[PDB]
């Protein structure tokens, strides 16, 4: 995952009229009626209990990370319009790999530092095997893997993955990619 493309993101395109007004039209509906005007809710926030109810949400396991990945606040804990418009927006598999990773890792990191520990990179080999399933479950494969790469280029030595440790751990199991093609 580059930085420099995040330069062609932070712009947008992705996003027009069409598809925040659509939007916008199912959404005012579901807010109650003292909230036609999605004008002045836009500066409010949007309660958790009003997601789980959103069908589009429900179907990813990733109901409430899918919100704090995508929430632009501070407390990243709560669903701002502004946000939910980059929500169904970069919902679909329509996002460039670069585009498709940032959110995905932020998917895996959540302490939203930048580095995944033992526990932390666990959790992202596993995802991409396979939610709850007897698929090779967790087992030395993820040391003996993040192990070579670390021997391919690293020389920070952090025991954790970053950047480098990236462009490996995603181009060097093809096989996972398959699981990483559409993870929200
Ligand atoms: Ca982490
Ligand atoms: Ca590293």
């Known amino acids: 995952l580059s930085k420099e493309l995040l330069a062609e993101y932070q712009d947008l395109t992705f996003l027009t009229k069409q598809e925040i007004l659509l939007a916008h039209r199912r959404f005012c509906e579901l807010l109650p009626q003292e909230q036609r005007s ?104 993820m040391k003996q893997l993040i192990d070579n790469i670390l021997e391919e280029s690293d020389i920070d030595r952090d025991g954790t993955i970053n950047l480098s440790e990236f462009q490996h751990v995603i181009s060097r199991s093809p096989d996972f990619a398959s699981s990483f093609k559409i993870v929200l």
């Open 38 to 141: 999605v004008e002045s809710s836009l500066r409010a926030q949007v309660p958790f209990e009003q997601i789980l109810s959103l069908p589009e949400l429900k179907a990813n396991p990733f109901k409430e990370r899918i919100c704090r990945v995508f929430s632009t606040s501070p407390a990243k804990d709560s669903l701002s319009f502004e946000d939910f418009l980059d929500l169904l927006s970069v919902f679909s598999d329509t996002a460039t790999p670069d585009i498709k990773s940032h959110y995905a890792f932020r998917i895996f990191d959540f302490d939203d530092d930048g580095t995944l520990n033992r526990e932390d990179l666990s959790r992202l080999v596993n995802c991409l095997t396979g939610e709850g399933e007897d698929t090779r479950l967790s087992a030395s494969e």
